[PDB]
Amino acid sequence: DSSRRQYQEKYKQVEQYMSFHKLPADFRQKIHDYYEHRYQGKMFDEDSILGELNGPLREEIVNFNCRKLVASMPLFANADPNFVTAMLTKLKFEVFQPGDYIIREGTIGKKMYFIQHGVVSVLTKGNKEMKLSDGSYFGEICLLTRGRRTASVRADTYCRLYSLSVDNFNEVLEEYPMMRRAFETVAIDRLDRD
Amino acid sequence: DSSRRQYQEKYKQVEQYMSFHKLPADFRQKIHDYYEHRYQGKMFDEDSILGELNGPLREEIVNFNCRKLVASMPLFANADPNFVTAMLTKLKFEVFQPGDYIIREGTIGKKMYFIQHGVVSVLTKGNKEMKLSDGSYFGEICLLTRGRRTASVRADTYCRLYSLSVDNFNEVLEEYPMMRRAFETVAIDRLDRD
Amino acid sequence: DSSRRQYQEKYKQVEQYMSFHKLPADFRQKIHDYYEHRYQGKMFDEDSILGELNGPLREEIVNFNCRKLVASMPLFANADPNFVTAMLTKLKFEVFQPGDYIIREGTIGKKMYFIQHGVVSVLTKGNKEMKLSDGSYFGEICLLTRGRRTASVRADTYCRLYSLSVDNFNEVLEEYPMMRRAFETVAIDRLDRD
Amino acid sequence: DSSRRQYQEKYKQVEQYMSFHKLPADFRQKIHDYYEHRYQGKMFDEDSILGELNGPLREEIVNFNCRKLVASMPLFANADPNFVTAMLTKLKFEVFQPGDYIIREGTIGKKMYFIQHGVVSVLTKGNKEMKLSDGSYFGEICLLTRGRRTASVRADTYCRLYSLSVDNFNEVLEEYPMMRRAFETVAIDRLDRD
Ligand SMILES: Nc1nc2c(ncn2[C@@H]2O[C@@H]3COP(=O)(O)O[C@H]3[C@H]2O)c(=O)[nH]1
Ligand SMILES: Nc1nc2c(ncn2[C@@H]2O[C@@H]3COP(=O)(O)O[C@H]3[C@H]2O)c(=O)[nH]1
Ligand SMILES: Nc1nc2c(ncn2[C@@H]2O[C@@H]3COP(=O)(O)O[C@H]3[C@H]2O)c(=O)[nH]1
Ligand SMILES: Nc1nc2c(ncn2[C@@H]2O[C@@H]3COP(=O)(O)O[C@H]3[C@H]2O)c(=O)[nH]1
C-alpha cells in the first residue's frame, strides 16, 4: 500500500502546515475530517495516471466512476452517450462539509453542481430552505444568465458533488446545443416559484 | 534499471487506483495490457528529458524515432526535411487497443492520425469498413473543414498512431502552406468515393 | 518534522547553486537570511496543499492567516467580507530585505503592496522619504493609471508584504466596483501632496 | 553533493531513454557531451529555486551570472541598468554543439541570440561564412521584420548563447522603445552588406 503511504505522508505535511500557521484545534479537526471524507486514506496523482492513458480508457473510467450519478438524473440517463461522456470529462469532484457555503447569493456565479450524494439547503431570502439531495443539480441559473447568484446554497450533510465551470459548460453545449434546454427548463421552473 | 523501477512503481499505483474505484477484473486486465503495449516496462519523464536538451538534439531525436513513419508515407518521404521536422515535433504518440473508437462519426473533429503500425476499420454508415494500416493517415477531413467527423474509425488490431491537433496542424501549414494540398487531395478522393 | 527536512534539504541545493555560480560570500549570506525570514526553517508545497482542499477551507485559511492585515487597515475592516475574501485569495506574500527596491520610479507598474509588517521609504525626487509601515499600502497609483511609477519605494527594515497584480486587482473590482474608490481616494491624496 | 547526485541520477535516465529508443553509439556520445558542457555534472531545479526568491534577489542573480555578457557588448554596457535587467530576465541560456543549425535560412524566425562564448558561421547563400564570436548577437532581423531568416547560422565551436523570443523582445521594447534602434542599426548594416 504505497497509496496509503502517500495519504499518511501528505496529511502529516498538512498537520505541520497548520501548526506553522497556528490554526485552532477546531479547524485542524475539520481539516482532518475533510481529508478523510475526500480521500479516504489513499492518494494517487490522478492527473498523472489518466494522462498516461488514452482517450477511450479515460472516458471508460470516468463513465464507470460516475455511473451512479448518471442513472441518478434524467439528463444523463436518456441523453446521447457521447453527450454524457463529454460532460463527465469536464466534471470536477468536490467534497463539502456541513454548513459550508457552496453558493453565496449575490456573487457572480461561474460554476454549477451535480449532487452525487448529500443534501443541500437553498436560501432564497428569508426562508426558503428548499432542500436538494442525490440526483439533482444547482447553480445552472448563472451559467445561463452570467449574472448574480439568485440564492445561497449550503451543505446540510456531507456533500459529494461534481462541479462544472461556465466555460466547460458552454464548450460542451457548443457540440450538443439542444441539450441546453434541459438546464433552461429547470432554471425557469425555479425562477418561476420565486 | 531505474526506468524499469519507474514503470513497476507507477503501475502499482494504477493497480491501487483501480482497486480504490473498484473496477471490474476485465477492465483492470485491459488497463494492464495498455501499459504494457504503450510503455513496455520502462518509464521516463520524456518531457523533462527533452526539455533539458536543445532544439537540434530534440529534432534529431524525433526524426530518428519517427524514421520508420517518415519513409513509410510519400508525404514525409519526398517533402522538405524542415517540413518533416516541424510536423514530427508536433506529433503525439498514442496507443489504441482492439475495438477502440479512435474517431466517432458525427462529432466535431480536432485531431488527425498517422498510422505507424496497426490496422483500423472505417465505418461510413453501413458498411464500409474500409481498412487502413501502416503508412496512411486519417482524420484530416475535419482539420480542413472544421466540421463533423464523416465516418467512424476503430482499431482493428493494436494501433501505434501519432496524433496531430488542428491547431498544430494549421501552425505548421502557416509556414509550409503548399503542403496543405497533400491533405486536401486525400480528403477529396475520400469524400468522392462516398 | 518532515517540513523542516524539506527546508534544510532545499536550502542545501541553494547553497550548491550559489557555489556553482560562484556568488560572493556577502550575497550568499543575504540569500541565507532571506530563506530564514521568508520560510523560517519549514517548507511545504502550499499550492499542492490548498489544491487538495476546497473553496471554503481555502478561504477560511487565507482569512485566518491574513487576519492581522485585515483588522490592520480600514479597507478590509469595514468592507464586505466577501470582498475581503476575494481580495485576500489573490494576494501573494513576499518578503523584502533592508535596502531593496520594491518599486523603481519611472517603470510601468503592475503591482501594489499591502504592508503586514515593516517600514518602507518613499522617494519622490529628492527628498521625500515619506515612511509607510504596518497597515498601509502602496503601488495603487499605476494600477489605476496604467502609467509609470510616480515614486520609488524601498524596504527600510525587513518587510513582510502582500502583493496584488493589476489584473487580479481589476478582476476583483469587476465584482465590487465601488470598492475602487478607496484606492482612488488614496492615490489622489497622494498625487495632491506632490 | 546532492546536486551532483541529481546530475548522475538524471543522466542515467537519459542513458536508458536512448537505449530504449536504440539510438546509435555516435549520437549517444554526442548527447553525453551535451549534458557535460551544458550542466557540468551538477543539476538544480533553477525554476523552483528562483521562484522561492523575490524580484530583487532574482535580478541580482541574473545580473551577476550575466555580468560577463553585459560588459562584453555596448548595448548593455552603456544602457539603462533597468533596461539591462529587464532584458536579462527574459534570456534563456542554451548550449549548441559544433555543426548545429542555430538558424536555418528561409524559416520564420522567432528568436535572436547573444553570444557569451563561442564562434558561429553565417551562410548567406554561397559563401559567406562570416564569423561571429563572444560579444555579438544575431537573429534580430526577423524579430524586427517578422519574416524569413535571411541567412543560416551554425555553431563552429561549442557555443554558450542566450536566446530571446520575439514576444519577450517586444515586451521589453514596450518599456524601452528607444532601445529598439540599437537592433535596427545592426540589422540595417547587415542587410546592407548583402
Ligand atoms: N432562485 C432559485 N434558485 C434555486 C431554486 N432551487 C434551486 N435553486 C438553485 O439555487 C441556485 C443559486 O445560484 P444560481 O442562481 O446560480 O442557481 C440557482 C439554482 O440552480 C429555486 O427554487 N429558486
Ligand atoms: N468519409 C470518408 N472518410 C474516410 C475514408 N477513408 C478514410 N477516411 C477517414 O475517415 C475519417 C473520419 O473522420 P474525418 O472525416 O474527420 O476524416 C475521415 C477520413 O480521413 C473514406 O473513404 N470516406
Ligand atoms: N507620488 C506619490 N506616491 C506615494 C506617496 N505616498 C505613497 N506613495 C506610493 O508610492 C508609489 C510609487 O509607485 P506608484 O506611483 O505606482 O504608487 C505610488 C504610491 O502608492 C506620495 O506621497 N506621493
Ligand atoms: N543577412 C545577413 N545576416 C547577418 C549578417 N551578419 C549576421 N547576420 C545574422 O544572420 C541572421 C540570420 O537570421 P536573421 O535574418 O533572422 O538575422 C540575421 C542576422 O542577425 C549579414 O551580414 N547578413
3-state secondary structure labels for all residues of B50-101:
HHHCCHHHHHHHHHHHCHHHHHHCHHHHCCCHHHHHHHHHCCEEEEECCCCE
DSSP state of B148: B
CATH number (domain holding residue C184): 2.60.120.10
Identity of the amino acid at D144: L
Asked whether residue C81 falls in the same domain as residue C121, the answer is yes
Q: Give dist(CA C144, CA B134) in Å, integer.
A: 60
Distance CA D144, CA D139 (A): 9
C 117-136 residues inside an 8 A Cβ radius of A: none
Distance of alpha carbon D82 from alpha carbon D87, whole angstroms? 8
- How far apart (Å, rounded) are the C-alpha atoms in residues D10 and D4? 10
A109 CA: nearest ligand 1 atom? 16
* Breaks in chain A after (C-N > 2.5 angstroms): none
Q: Which of residues 10-49 of A touch B (CB under 8 A)?
A: 40, 42, 44-46, 49
Which segments of chain A are extended strands (E)? 92-96, 101-103, 111-117, 119-123, 131-133, 137-138, 152-155, 159-165
DSSP string over D96-154: E-TT-EEE-TTSB--EEEEEEE-EEEEE-SSS---EEETT-EE-HHHHHH-SB-SSEEE
Sequence-separated (6 or more) residues with CB below 8 Å from residue D109: D103, D139, D141, D142, D143, D147, D148, D149, D166
CB neighbourhood size of C118 (10 A): 19
For residues C163 and C113, what is the distance between their CA atoms, to the nearest angstrom? 5
Phi-psi region of B109 (alpha: psi -120 to 50; beta: other; left: phi over 0): beta
Asked whether the beta carbons of B134 and B118 are under 8 A apart, the reply is yes
d(C-alpha D36, C-alpha A161), whole Å:
51
CA D24, D26, D29, D34: dihedral to nearest 10 degrees?
-100
All 3 cell numbers of residue A146?
Answer: 452570467
**CA atoms lying within 13 Å on the CB side of residue A80:** 14
Q: Chain B contacts of D27, Cβ < 8 Å?
A: 60, 64
Among D75, D184, D190, residue to substitute to test ligand 4 (most atoms within 8 Å of Cβ): D190
Q: Note down the domain range covering A161.
A: 67-194
Identity of the residue in C1, C53, C64 whose CB atom sits nearest the CB atom of A23: C64
Residues in A touching C52 (Cβ below 8 Å): 10, 14, 35, 38-39
- C188 Cβ contact list (under 8 Å, min separation 6): none
- In terms of C-beta distances under 8 Å and separation of at least 24 residues, what long-range contacts does D166-171 make, across chains too? D166/D109, D166/D110, D166/D111, D166/D112, D166/D142, D168/D90, D169/D90, D169/D112, D169/D143, D170/D143, D171/D90
The set of cell numbers assigned to C115 is 504592508
C166 and C94 inside one domain: yes
SS3 at position A138: strand
Partners of B137 in the β-ladder: B114
What are the chain C neighbours of D47 within 8 Å (beta carbons)?
none
Task: Look up residue C184 and give its three cell numbers.
Answer: 482612488
Rounded-to-integer distance, Cα A117 and Cα C1, Å: 37
- Verify whether the Cβ–Cβ distance A52 to B31 is below 8 Å: no
Interface of C with D in 79-98 (CB under 8 A): 94-97
What is the rounded CA–CA span in Å between residue D152 and residue D123?
Answer: 5
Residue D72 CA, chain-centre distance (Å), reads 15
Task: Round to whole Å and give the CA distance between A52 and A97.
Answer: 32
Neighbours of B (≥3 Cβ pairs closer than 8 A)?
A: A, D
User: Is D47 in the same domain as D125?
Assistant: no
User: SS3 of C99, please?
Assistant: coil
Residue B125 to residue B127: CA distance in whole angstroms: 6
How many Å lie between the alpha carbon of A55 and the closest alpha carbon of chain B? 8
D193 and D146 together in one domain = yes
**A175 CA distance to ligand 2 centroid (A)?**
20
C-beta of residue D163 within 8 angstroms of C-beta of residue D92: yes
> Is the CB of B121 within 6 Å of ligand 2?
no
Same domain? For A78 and A172 the reply is yes
Written as nine digits, the cell of D62 is: 541574473
Minimum distance, in Å, between the CA of residue D159 and any CA atom of chain B: 12
> Are residues A38 and A12 part of one domain?
yes
Question: Is the domain of A88 the same as that of A152?
Answer: yes
> Which method was it determined by?
X-ray
* Cα four-point dihedral sign A104, A106, A108, A110: positive
Q: Does one domain contain both A115 and A28?
A: no
DSSP three-state, residue D94: strand
Could you tell me the three cell numbers for D155?
A: 555553431
A193 is in an annotated binding site: no
CB contact under 8 A, A56 and B97: yes
Do residue C60 and residue C150 come from a single domain?
Answer: no
- What is the structure's resolution, reported in angstroms to one decimal? 2.2
* Helix pair C25-38, C2-20: axis angle to 10 deg: 160
Please indicate, yes or no, whether residues D17 and D97 belong to a single structural domain of this protein: no
- Smallest-distance ligand from the CA of D143: 4
Residue whose grid cell is 498601509: C136
- A49/B17 CB distance under 8 A: yes
Asked which of B66, B86, B102 is the last residue of a domain, the reply is B66
- Using a CB-CB cut-off of 8 Å, the residues of chain C touching D56 are 96-97, 100-101
Q: Is D193 in the pocket of ligand 4 (CB under 6 A)?
A: yes
Question: Residue C13 and residue D3: Cβ atoms within 8 Å?
Answer: yes
Residue A127 CB burial class (10 angstroms; 0-12, 13-18, ≥19): exposed
Q: How far are the Cα atoms of C75, C138, C168, D64, D162 from residue C131, in angstroms, in the given order? A: 20, 11, 26, 31, 40
Q: Report whether A67 contacts A46 (CB < 8 A).
A: no
In this structure, which amino acid lies at residue A174? Answer: E
Of B43, B66, B89, the one marking the end of a domain is B66
Last residue of a domain, one of C66, C85, C111: C66
- Co-location of B118 and B78 in the same domain: yes
Provide the 8-state DSSP code for C108.
Answer: B
Q: Mark whether C99 and C170 lie in a shared domain.
A: yes
Q: Which of residues 135-194 of D touch C (CB under 8 A)?
A: 174-175
Q: Which residues of D touch B89 (CB under 8 A)?
A: none
CATH of the domain at D16: 1.10.287.630
* Cα angle: D145, vertex D148, D152; to 5 degrees: 120
Q: Is the dihedral of CA A46, A52, A53, A58 positive or negative?
A: positive
Of C45, C57, C175, the CB nearest to A34: C57
User: What angle do helix axes B81-89 and B55-65 make, rounded to 10 degrees?
Assistant: 90
**Beta pairing partners, D101:** D154
Biggest CA-to-CA distance, chain D: 53
**Ligand of minimum distance to the alpha carbon of C147:** 3
Q: Which of B161, B47, B96 is nearest to A58 (CA)?
A: B96
Cβ(C106)–Cβ(C95) below 8 Å? no
Check the annotation: does D58 bind a ligand.
no
Helix (H) or strand (E) holding C24: none
Q: What is the tally of structural domains in chain B?
A: 2
